[PDB]
Design a protein around this ligand. Structure first.
Ligand SMILES: *[C@@H]1O[C@H](CO)[C@@H](O[C@@H]2O[C@H](CO)[C@@H](O[C@@H]3O[C@H](CO[C@H]4O[C@H](CO[C@H]5O[C@H](CO)[C@@H](O)[C@H](O)[C@@H]5O)[C@@H](O)[C@H](O)[C@@H]4O)[C@@H](O)[C@H](O[C@H]4O[C@H](CO)[C@@H](O)[C@H](O)[C@@H]4O)[C@@H]3O)[C@H](O)[C@H]2NC(C)=O)[C@H](O)[C@H]1NC(C)=O
Ligand SMILES: *[C@@H]1O[C@H](CO)[C@@H](O[C@@H]2O[C@H](CO)[C@@H](O[C@@H]3O[C@H](CO[C@H]4O[C@H](CO)[C@@H](O)[C@H](O)[C@@H]4O)[C@@H](O)[C@H](O[C@H]4O[C@H](CO)[C@@H](O)[C@H](O)[C@@H]4O)[C@@H]3O)[C@H](O)[C@H]2NC(C)=O)[C@H](O)[C@H]1NC(C)=O
Lengths: 209, 210
């Protein structure tokens, strides 16, 4: 039985201005599960109504999540949120907490590239974006074509890794089709980051050819 | 509480260095102060070389036992199966992990090497990026070469193998370079070592800062 508690995404926090946090508990012994995820703040101030969600997994196991809307200003100013997990079987005591990361801020550098044709694959290319030298590690990455944001499922972004310096980097991968680049041969990699500017976003355009 | 993992050799060790090893990792959340025995064996009945062993007590109060077994290069490539049998006086039953070269779907990697443009304020630095994709199985080794010489491993960072859309996996390798280096010789090579690559289990691509 493990428990995790994530921070808001930069996209939700800055662009949407409706940040949330998610208490995720991955069980390894499901039974009569009246498992409770209790929310609180370090300050003692009221928490909003949260959303509980449970999904039975294929490997004969129960996964339970609770999502709490947080105040944008409350998060930025440094509030700490706490998820308490109470389980019947376990000795009733498990706590996870989250708050905005501290430390220096640094804006991301964004670089976007297009692969050349590989023999046997004329009607597709792979677009690669390198986002680097940012801190903290929290970052949202999106792709756009015709200034419409592409579904998130279309790309995959790597987890933040430290550079040889103090900042982090991610890579993002996007497969595109001939029909798309023939319609408009320009794709935008956009990184949303708090230290980024202006509007907490930095983006770079790339073309096939 | 007891977990065991058996890894395959790195393609670099297997095909370039030709000293492959396999590693049996045993994780124990609640150390019942006793001897977790790791035994190596081959399916063929042939003898195993002497293996290393290392017990580490972790921060979370847990015992991690790792054992590395040197393996014949020809033996691995011709389909030998290696087994790790884990045992402890007080446990349900013996955990048995086996490993062998894949007989399922294979696919050589596509390799693409890129160089970042100049960023304002950093004209004396560039980042080299390599995309390696559509390979399977996931086992892959990445080297960077400059002056026909392999750079130190700690110089570059490779991402974890992720599933592409379609089939196979991708990784990205990242290499920071300085002006001194590309002015001396403006040609860096990203080489991928992968079992499905032909004819020599390698695919590589050069890039220049220009
Ligand atoms: C039975 O099968 C199930 C289902 O596959 C297994 O359930 C998985 O177990 C693993 C093992 O712990 C969990 O991994 C952990 O996840 C933590 C949460 O962060 C990750 O998930 C977030 C979830 O959000 C994503 O999915 C939702 C919808 O599902 C989307 O809405 C959302 O947009 C995301 O796409 C992500 O937000 C986040 O980016 C991560 O992907 C991690 O915190 C945790 O990492 C720990 O360890 C890391 C180093 O190893 C470290 O870096 C971290 O800081 C942290 O300490 C770990 O990755 C899966 O989350 C869990 N999945 C589900 C769906 O329940 C189950 O394990 C398996 N049982 C057995 C016995 O094998
Ligand atoms: C107490 O603290 C210790 C130390 O941190 C924790 O021990 C870790 O436990 C985890 C989970 O068992 C181990 O993670 C597993 O490692 C395996 C070995 O990884 C090798 O291969 C990678 C490939 O690059 C190398 O990077 C690495 O160095 C090793 O050589 C992986 O094979 C495992 O992945 C497999 O299983 C998972 C499911 O568990 C699948 O999803 C994967 O696809 C894959 O099949 C896994 O990553 C970790 O190695 C242990 N650390 C150490 C240092 O030994 C304890 O878990 C912790 N106790 C508790 C209760 O939290």
């Amino acid at each position: 039985v493990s428990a995790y508690l994530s921070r808001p995404s930069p996209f939700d926090l800055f662009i949407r201005k409706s940040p949330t946090i998610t208490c995720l508990v991955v069980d390894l012994a499901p039974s009569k599960g009246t498992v409770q995820l209790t929310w609180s703040r370090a300050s003692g101030k009221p928490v909003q109504h949260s959303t509980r969600k449970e999904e039975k997994q294929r490997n004969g196991t129960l996964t339970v999540t609770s999502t709490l809307p947080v105040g944008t200003r409350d998060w930025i100013e440094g509030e700490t949120y706490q998820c308490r997990v109470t389980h019947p079987h376990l000795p009733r005591a498990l706590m996870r907490s989250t708050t905005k990361t501290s430390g220096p801020r640094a804006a991301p550098e964004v670089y976007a590239f297009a692969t050349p044709e590989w023999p046997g694959s004329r009607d597709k290319r792979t677009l690669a974006c390198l986002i680097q030298n940012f801190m903290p590690e929290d970052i949202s990455v999106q792709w756009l074509h015709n200034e419409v944001q592409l579904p998130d499922a279309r790309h995959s972004t790597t987890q933040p890794r430290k550079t040889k310096g103090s900042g982090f980097f991610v890579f993002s991968r996007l497969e595109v089709t001939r029909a798309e680049w023939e319609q408009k041969d320009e794709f935008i990699c956009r990184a949303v980051h708090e230290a980024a500017s202006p509007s907490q976003t930095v983006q770079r355009a790339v073309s096939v050819n």
